[model samples]
Target: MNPPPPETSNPNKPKRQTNQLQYLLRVVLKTLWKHQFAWPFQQPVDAVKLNLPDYYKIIKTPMDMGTIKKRLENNYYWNAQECIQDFNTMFTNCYIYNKPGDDIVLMAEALEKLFLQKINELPTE
Candidate 1:
């Protein structure tokens, strides 16, 4: 007897995964990963920036100080940042471009919308 074709529709369904709070974290992580928002602000890079000169002291050398300073001075939260901040709200309003219960699908649509918005905002090369 052969098996099924793998339920890509709702992989979490059989498990009866009840919108586990982990999904919220997953959403957050997905947003973060998509935009790489926290990357620019994280330790080493994030750490040094958040910690300012303290991180440079720890590293005994600077970490791309010029770009870091420029980015900080600008303080413009990129498109990804917009997405991360609005994750839940957009997820709810955007009508899950994929199926309702599929996590990956949900993320794909969310990211698509975000990237589109980002592109629209670009100055155009």
Candidate 2:
């Protein structure tokens, strides 16, 4: 089985530095790779293409850990929340958009929970 494409699947673009979010996304996807309950899709590609559209957006964005940390330090609460919320909205929306799913939505919630946990663990500036 081929592994899912890396964040920089587009070879024309130079590889962007991996951020915490990207790393977390990779970890989450990997953990779900062979799960029967969480993944109804037969292939990882479907997970990335359909289930994780919001995450794909983050992969495409140029923002990195440095920018995010600076923003957190700079008192942009809503800005930061918007970034986080985007993932939540995307996950839930995707889950609902796909229809008649069990355990799939929880997959997204778990990712969101871990992300928040990771963010809280980071040292503040």
Candidate 3:
């Protein structure tokens, strides 16, 4: 019997799988990505600015204008600081449900609803 041919390896090439989670993160957080939020602030906060220690909770948390105003007071700085830390941590550690492409579309739609909830709460003066 003839000897079997030697096996060839092309391990230099990498796999082609896309990091869907990374794509989702960019879609949700990057302002130029398709579904960006219409920020209500006069200065216009982007995703990174909205995530910072001074702003995340104020933007993402559900609070009435008076309550938010009170929290912005000098004596409330500690509480405000705590809220900021908590919100930033949550944003940094945000999770996406692990699903394939079609399911990820569903996830995106669901997230957009939550985004709209925040927009709906914005002060419309």
Candidate 4:
């Protein structure tokens, strides 16, 4: 159903860019996107009005592929593993903060596993 706040319901919202890349992970990222579940969903501090106080204390920083493209644009990491290592840490701490049985945890593991397979296939240029 259509609703007010057009921006919120905008299905036509754009993805940042679709240009070609010299970066290695660009190909891998596209594959990850095809699977459509590589989300780390970093919890924003004071996101829900500071409701989860303990969560903030335990987690120092957060990350996801949402930032991947931004970092990618800046050409942040030369080595693909180094780039992956960043998000791997993002996924790694996930097991620490969330229950192992949680849905997000499973997604992290799958995405991380998916990454390991894909990145490993690169053969290090």
Question: Model 4: how large is the Cα RMSD against the reference?
Answer: 9.2
- What's the lDDT for candidate 1? 0.35
The lDDT ranking, best first, is 4, 2, 1, 3
**Runs in model 3 with CA error above 4 Å?**
1-101
Candidate 1 residues 49-102, lDDT tens each? Answer: 344444333333222212322322233223333323433333333342235657
Per-model TM-score, in order, reads 0.23, 0.33, 0.21, 0.65
What is the C-alpha lDDT profile of model 3 across 1-125, one tens digit per residue?
Answer: 22222222234533232232232223322321233322231122343644445344444432221222232332233322332343233322232212345543444445446544543443322
- Judge candidate 4 at residue 10 and give its lDDT: 24
lDDT of candidate 4 over 23-125, digit per residue (tens): 3346766666556565334322232453565764576555555455555655554455555766676677678788978987888788778777866666435
Query: Which candidate gets the maximum TM-score versus the true structure?
Result: 4
Residue 8 lDDT, candidate 3, scale 0-100: 24
Instruction: Report how far off residue 75 is in candidate 4 (Å).
Output: 1.2
Q: Cα RMSD (Å) between model 3 and the true structure?
A: 23.8
Sort every candidate by TM-score, greatest first.
4, 2, 1, 3
Angstrom error at residue 55, model 3: 33
RMSD vs true structure, all candidates: 20.7, 10.4, 23.8, 9.2
lDDT string for model 2 (85-112, tens) is 5445445554654454456666656655
Score each candidate by Cα lDDT: 0.35, 0.42, 0.32, 0.56
Judged by whole-model lDDT over C-alpha atoms, candidate 3 comes out at 0.32
